[PDB]
Amino acid sequence: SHEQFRAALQLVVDPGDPRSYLDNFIKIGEGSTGIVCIATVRSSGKLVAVKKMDLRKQQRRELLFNEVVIMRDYQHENVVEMYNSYLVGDELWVVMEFLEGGALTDIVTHTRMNEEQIAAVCLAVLQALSVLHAQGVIHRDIKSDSILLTHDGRVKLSDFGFCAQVSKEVPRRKSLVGTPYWMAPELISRLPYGPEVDIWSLGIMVIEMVDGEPPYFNEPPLKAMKMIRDNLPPRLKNLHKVSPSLKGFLDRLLVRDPAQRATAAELLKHPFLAKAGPPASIVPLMRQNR
Ligand SMILES: Nc1nccc(-n2cc(C(=O)N3CCC[C@@H](N)C3)c3ccc(C#CC4(O)CCCCC4)cc32)n1
């Protein structure tokens, strides 16, 4: 029931009304399960971002739990920091860090990134994924929209609306959740899957950074959704533009066998991630000056 769900939420969220100390709401997106705004904290003049998700308009209402239960003040240098969570009226509100460089989607649709910057983004994603897999969490929707930047080129991971916990005891999942063009091959076929789905999506995101779109991004969602199931790993339309180091690194990502996919903890020792430029390398890719 709606009311039982609201009651359960009120036991984990911070009480009261955040509209007391927030104003100048500026809308910035409609991402995953809710709209995302920016507000100023009048008590300080600082800026924060606010994810508003209405319980009434949800496919699965049970998705709202995880990001306030799993990502409850979990700190990490490469993961968007959540400050507070409130239940306002009929919507759940998440207040967090304001990442000012936009999403990575804006860069891959407008410019071409050199291997030195691809390695930077990947180093950050794997750094955060390593810890997230050790603690038992799967992102389950890693893609361009899930990656935010600061003004200084630092990269953080976001959009945990689809994440899940595995930990000990039961260690797998079988839920068909995410974005169609970015998911694993043992996804569309319901099979017990662990953190490795993320890694696969990461590989597809690598493809993004090389071409500006996931394999079969031109086909409608189901038209490609089924299309990847039988096929072998896709390959980039611009493979001639990528060095063999990137190609090897990516060849240990888009492995069809989940038991022969690489693990983020073991992917950090790879050679390609020596090409990782300082975060400043990413800075010229943002809209300040392309
Ligand atoms: N600059 C800035 N800063 C902070 C947030 C933010 N942001 C914009 C979103 C948005 O709508 N986008 C993304 C861009 C492309 C567009 N198509 C759609 C968006 C969606 C979800 C979350 C999330 C979350 C958490 O799970 C992360 C861990 C802690 C709990 C909350 C954040 C989002 N953007």
UniProtKB/Swiss-Prot annotation:
Ranges of residues in domain Protein kinase: 22-273
Annotated segments matching region GEF-interaction domain (GID): 1-24
Bridged cysteine pairs (disulfide): none
Record-annotated active site: 141 (proton acceptor)
Subunit structure: Interacts with FGFR2 and GRB2. Interacts tightly with GTP-bound but not GDP-bound CDC42/p21 and weakly with RAC1. Interacts with INKA1. Interacts with SH3RF2. Interacts with RHOU and PAXI; the PAK4-RHOU complex protects RHOU from ubiquitination and acts as a scaffold to suppport paxillin/PAXI phosphorylation.
Designated gene of the protein: PAK4
Residues bound to ATP: 28-36, 51, 97-99, 159-161
UniProt-recorded name of the protein: Serine/threonine-protein kinase PAK 4
Organism: Homo sapiens
Residues recorded with modification Phosphoserine: 175
Family: Belongs to the protein kinase superfamily. STE Ser/Thr protein kinase family. STE20 subfamily.
Localization terms from the record: Cytoplasm
Role of this protein: Serine/threonine-protein kinase that plays a role in a variety of different signaling pathways including cytoskeleton regulation, cell adhesion turnover, cell migration, growth, proliferation or cell survival. Activation by various effectors including growth factor receptors or active CDC42 and RAC1 results in a conformational change and a subsequent autophosphorylation on several serine and/or threonine residues. Phosphorylates and inactivates the protein phosphatase SSH1, leading to increased inhibitory phosphorylation of the actin binding/depolymerizing factor cofilin.
Tissue spec: Highest expression in prostate, testis and colon.
